[PDB]
Amino acid sequence: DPCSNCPAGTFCDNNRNQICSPCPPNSFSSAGGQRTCDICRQCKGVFRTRKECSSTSNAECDCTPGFHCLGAGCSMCEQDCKQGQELTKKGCKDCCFGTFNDQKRGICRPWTNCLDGKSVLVNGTKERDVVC
Amino acid sequence: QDPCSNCPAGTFCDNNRNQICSPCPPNSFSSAGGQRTCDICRQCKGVFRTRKECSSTSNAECDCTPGFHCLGAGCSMCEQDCKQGQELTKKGCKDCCFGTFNDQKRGICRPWTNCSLDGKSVNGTKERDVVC
Amino acid sequence: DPCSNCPAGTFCDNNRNQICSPCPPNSFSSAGGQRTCDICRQCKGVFRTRKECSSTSNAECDCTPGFHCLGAGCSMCEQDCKQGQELTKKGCKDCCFGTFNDQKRGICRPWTNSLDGKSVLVNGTKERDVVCG
Amino acid sequence: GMFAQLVAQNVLLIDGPLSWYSDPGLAGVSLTGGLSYKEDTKELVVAKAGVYYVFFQLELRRVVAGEGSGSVSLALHLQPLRAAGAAALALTVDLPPASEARNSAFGFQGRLLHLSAGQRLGVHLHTEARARHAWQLTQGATVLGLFRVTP
Amino acid sequence: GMFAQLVAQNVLLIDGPLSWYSDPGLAGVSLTGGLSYKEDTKELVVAKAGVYYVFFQLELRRVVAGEGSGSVSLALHLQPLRSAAAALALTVDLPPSEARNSAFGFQGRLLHLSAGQRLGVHLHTEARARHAWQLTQGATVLGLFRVT
Amino acid sequence: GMFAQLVAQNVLLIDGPLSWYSDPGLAGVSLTGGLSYKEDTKELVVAKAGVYYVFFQLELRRVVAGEGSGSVSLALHLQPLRSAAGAAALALTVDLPPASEARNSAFGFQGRLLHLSAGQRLGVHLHTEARARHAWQLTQGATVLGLFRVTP
Numbered sequence: 001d002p003c004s005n006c007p008a009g010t011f012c013d014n015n016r017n018q019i020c021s022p023c024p025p026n027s028f029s030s031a032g033g034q035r036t037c038d039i040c041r042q043c044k045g046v047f048r049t050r051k052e053c054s055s056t057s058n059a060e061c062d063c064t065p066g067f068h069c070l071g072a073g074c075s076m077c078e079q080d081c082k083q084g085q086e087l088t089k090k091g092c093k094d095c096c097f098g099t100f101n102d103q104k105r106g107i108c109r110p111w112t113n114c115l116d117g118k119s120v121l122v123n124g125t126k127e128r129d130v131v132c
Numbered sequence: 133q134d135p136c137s138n139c140p141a142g143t144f145c146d147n148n149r150n151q152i153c154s155p156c157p158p159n160s161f162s163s164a165g166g167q168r169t170c171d172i173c174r175q176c177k178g179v180f181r182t183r184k185e186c187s188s189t190s191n192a193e194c195d196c197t198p199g200f201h202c203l204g205a206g207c208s209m210c211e212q213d214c215k216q217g218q219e220l221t222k223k224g225c226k227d228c229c230f231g232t233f234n235d236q237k238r239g240i241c242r243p244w245t246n247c248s249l250d251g252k253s254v255n256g257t258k259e260r261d262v263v264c
Numbered sequence: 265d266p267c268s269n270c271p272a273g274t275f276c277d278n279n280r281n282q283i284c285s286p287c288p289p290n291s292f293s294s295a296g297g298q299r300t301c302d303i304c305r306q307c308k309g310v311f312r313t314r315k316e317c318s319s320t321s322n323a324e325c326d327c328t329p330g331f332h333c334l335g336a337g338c339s340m341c342e343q344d345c346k347q348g349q350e351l352t353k354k355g356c357k358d359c360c361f362g363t364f365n366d367q368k369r370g371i372c373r374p375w376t377n378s379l380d381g382k383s384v385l386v387n388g389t390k391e392r393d394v395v396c397g
Numbered sequence: 398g399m400f401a402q403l404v405a406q407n408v409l410l411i412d413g414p415l416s417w418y419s420d421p422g423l424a425g426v427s428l429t430g431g432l433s434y435k436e437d438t439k440e441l442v443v444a445k446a447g448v449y450y451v452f453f454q455l456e457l458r459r460v461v462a463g464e465g466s467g468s469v470s471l472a473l474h475l476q477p478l479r480a481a482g483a484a485a486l487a488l489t490v491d492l493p494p495a496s497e498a499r500n501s502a503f504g505f506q507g508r509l510l511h512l513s514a515g516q517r518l519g520v521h522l523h524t525e526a527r528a529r530h531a532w533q534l535t536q537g538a539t540v541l542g543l544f545r546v547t548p
Numbered sequence: 549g550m551f552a553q554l555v556a557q558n559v560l561l562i563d564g565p566l567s568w569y570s571d572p573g574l575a576g577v578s579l580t581g582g583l584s585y586k587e588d589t590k591e592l593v594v595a596k597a598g599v600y601y602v603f604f605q606l607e608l609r610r611v612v613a614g615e616g617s618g619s620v621s622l623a624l625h626l627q628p629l630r631s632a633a634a635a636l637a638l639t640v641d642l643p644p645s646e647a648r649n650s651a652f653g654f655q656g657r658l659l660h661l662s663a664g665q666r667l668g669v670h671l672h673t674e675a676r677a678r679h680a681w682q683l684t685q686g687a688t689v690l691g692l693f694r695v696t
Numbered sequence: 697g698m699f700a701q702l703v704a705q706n707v708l709l710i711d712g713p714l715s716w717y718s719d720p721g722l723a724g725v726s727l728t729g730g731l732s733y734k735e736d737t738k739e740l741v742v743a744k745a746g747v748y749y750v751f752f753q754l755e756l757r758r759v760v761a762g763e764g765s766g767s768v769s770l771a772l773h774l775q776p777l778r779s780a781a782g783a784a785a786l787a788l789t790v791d792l793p794p795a796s797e798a799r800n801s802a803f804g805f806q807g808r809l810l811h812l813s814a815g816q817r818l819g820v821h822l823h824t825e826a827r828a829r830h831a832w833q834l835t836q837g838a839t840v841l842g843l844f845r846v847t848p
């Protein structure tokens with residue numbers, strides 16, 4: 001078909017004799033052949049633009065400061081992981097028992113062992129290392 | 133020009149019979165001239181009572197049955213009469229605030245009497261004035 | 265009409281001159297006259313087949329072991345009634361005050377009685393009979 | 398053309414068949430071609446046989462504050478029975494629990510139905526009563542409609 | 549034929565009238581026959597009078613985790629006012645939880661529409677962290693086709 | 697005319713493509729004009745190109761008491777793709793209420809106008825957020841795909 005010669009970034013305009021028109025503003029086509037162009041992804045509110053929409057590729061979003069992406073293709077934002085928690089693929093979960101995270105946006109390290117021949121001056125929690 | 137523009141409120145412009153002005157059918161009304169149809173009369177049933185009857189030219193208004201009072205614009209819902217501790221506001225029967233009380237049902241909050249400024253001894257609650 | 269002579273188990277095929285075609289697989293018609301056949305009820309997952317679908321009647325379902333029917337026409341299954349409970353039409357409800365059920369899938373009997381002239385060694389519970397002294 | 402739309406008269410939630418406004422001077426109401434309404438049996442009567450897209454809409458409104466829950470159902474029934482207890486179209490709407498500002502409830506369903514000459518369509522309303530005085534049908538919003546697809 | 553479908557441009561939940569993609573090179577968008585879109589007033593303009601099946605679709609997506617509740621409404625308004633002082637109206641409740649991150653609405657009915665009738669859609673939101681929810685793009689749709 | 701309606705065969709909630717009853721002797725089922733069903737690929741095949749109103753209906757029923765929650769989705773996919781990749785022409789999610797007072801069903805309906813090419817194949821993928829996939833099931837004779845031609 002003549003539509004199979006319209007390159008990515010145009011559509012095959014059925015309204016004007018199967019000609020290759022440019023994609024209209026805020027739209028794109030990633031493959032050749034298409035009878036229409038898909039709408040450009042919008043990045044607003046909590047979203048921000050990581051990659052601009054082009055005639056040939058959709059825009060990619062990231063999150064504003066204070067938040068981080070979640071899901072495939074940054075489907076939603078989530079507030080930065082607090083003191084006791086840690087960032088996983090499926091959200092900020094609590095640190096597991098025997099581990100702690102002291103800072104915000106941090107990663108859980110295992111409690112220090114007081115095996116070292118010392119006494120537990122202060123117990124270990126989800127937020128705080130053991131004290132010796 | 134437009135023959136429908138000569139049909140007065142309380143008729144419709146009957147497209148089925150050569151743009152003539154028919155009376156609104158029972159349980160309907162038209163508040164403006166020109167209309168191609170009449171709107172259904174508001175019904176007031178169950179908890180609702182009729183404050184104003186439907187006419188050919190105006191919609192019916194509802195009120196609430198005894199024990200209840202209106203709420204929302206145009207009496208969209210009824211609410212049970214405010215109890216002892218509470219008071220009637222636009223957005224429902226809320227509790228009396230700190231420092232105030234309401235003793236009766238369907239009442240209004242007055243401020244607690246002051247025993248210390250009056251030189252006597254005292255405790256006030258949401259339902260009851262202060263035990264001077 | 266000619267459709268009024270198509271018996272239960274056929275449909276009146278409007279596509280081919282009002283003739284009586286057999287109901288297609290996994291369908292049935294319980295009356296004569298029908299222009300279409302209704303789909304056979306499926307019994308899968310928790311469900312099991314009590315009665316097979318025929319050309320003239322829908323399939324009936326029952327529940328798998330561990331579960332029992334509930335609602336009209338076995339609309340859902342429910343896990344077998346536990347120790348303290350008993351089977352009613354509207355589900356496994358608790359035994360009432362004064363009564364107990366000791367076994368699973370059981371029925372509530374009333375607590376044994378002061379009227380027999382003995383003492384309460386152990387008290388009565390939703391799960392357990394009274395223990396007289 | 399060949400279509401109709403009817404608006405339910407009913408406001409209270411009572412188990413039983415719905416009455417319908419059928420006069421085309423009413424807003425939201427149409428009857429055209431071979432389609433008519435039996436006021437007595439509360440049935441929509443189809444004159445010409447064919448395939449129709451039939452839809453119904455159901456809207457509920459909370460009318461007593463902080464009260465009312467449960468379930469409300471519509472069921473379209475054909476006559477003559479085109480099997481036993483055949484419900485050609487069926488819609489249930491759940492009433493949210495008595496909460497933060499959930500005072501309405503919507504339902505829409507549509508499908509293509511084959512309808513015979515003289516086919517009568519009526520709608521039964523069923524309610525899982527849980528303070529059925531606290532909820533009511535939203536007026537001018539419970540609608541039965543259809544238009545002919547077959548040319 | 550005689551039909552149209554439009555896709556909402558709006559992503560954020562702001563009280564006010566919706567803008568619409570109206571170019572038929574866009575996917576999900578059609579305008580055919582005597583139907584056109586006023587970009588300025590944000591209105592769909594009907595040329596020939598008749599009975600139409602009109603529908604609209606509304607889809608929401610949670611965009612901040614563990615946040616956002618409330619209610620969102622669409623309302624179709626005709627101009628000139630065909631009858632009195634909302635021809636089609638849809639409310640979708642935003643769930644408060646264990647993964648209900650979306651919310652769907654569909655409504656349809658037959659409407660009698662005059663020559664030059666203008667259709668516009670007002671979005672209303674019961675704001676409860678209206679930054680936590682957004683319109684799902686390419687999914688809030690207004691459509692109609694002629695039945696007469 | 698130019699229309700079709702299909703009724704899903706599937707009762708269990710399994711991720712994957714839906715099978716469809718396509719015989720017009722079945723109640724709720726129609727195929728007319730240039731419309732046909734490939735039994736092997738589970739696809740509805742459109743002969744003439746045009747603008748169609750396409751809808752699908754989804755109904756679920758709780759089948760184990762006091763059990764089952766989560767989410768269930770339908771997704772219509774075209775072939776060949778009118779556009780891009782992973783294009784979901786029509787998409788419906790229904791939330792299953794939590795395991796409660798008498799919420800044993802769940803409904804979904806969605807419709808829109810779609811431009812469909814000659815030979816366009818429509819298939820439907822069912823996705824389930826399994827919380828309990830044994831507790832809930834498709835209501836039979838109620839998960840429906842339909843369309844009729846709008847273009848004269």
Ligand SMILES: *[C@@H]1O[C@H](CO)[C@@H](O)[C@H](O)[C@H]1NC(C)=O
Binds near residue numbers: 120121122123
């Ligand atoms: C720490 O917790 C352990 C039990 O895990 C307990 O034996 C000990 O007394 C605690 N020590 C302090 C300092 O609280």
Ligand SMILES: *[C@@H]1O[C@H](CO)[C@@H](O)[C@H](O)[C@H]1NC(C)=O
Binds near residue numbers: 254255
């Ligand atoms: C009244 O309440 C105040 C605190 O609000 C307290 O000083 C006092 O105990 C109470 N007086 C009496 C008489 O109970």
Ligand SMILES: [Cl-]
Binds near residue numbers: 177406407408
């Ligand atoms: Cl009534």
Ligand SMILES: [Cl-]
Binds near residue numbers: 446513514
């Ligand atoms: Cl016939």
Ligand SMILES: [Cl-]
Binds near residue numbers: 044557558559560
């Ligand atoms: Cl925006």
Ligand SMILES: [Cl-]
Binds near residue numbers: 705706707708
């Ligand atoms: Cl299966």
Ligand SMILES: [Cl-]
Binds near residue numbers: 300510722723724
């Ligand atoms: Cl049928």
Ligand SMILES: [Cl-]
Binds near residue numbers: 577811
């Ligand atoms: Cl199109």
Ligand SMILES: [Cl-]
Binds near residue numbers: 712773819820
């Ligand atoms: Cl698929």
Ligand code: NA
Binds near residue numbers: 157158
């Ligand atoms: Na009348």
Ligand code: NA
Binds near residue numbers: 273286287288319
């Ligand atoms: Na047979």
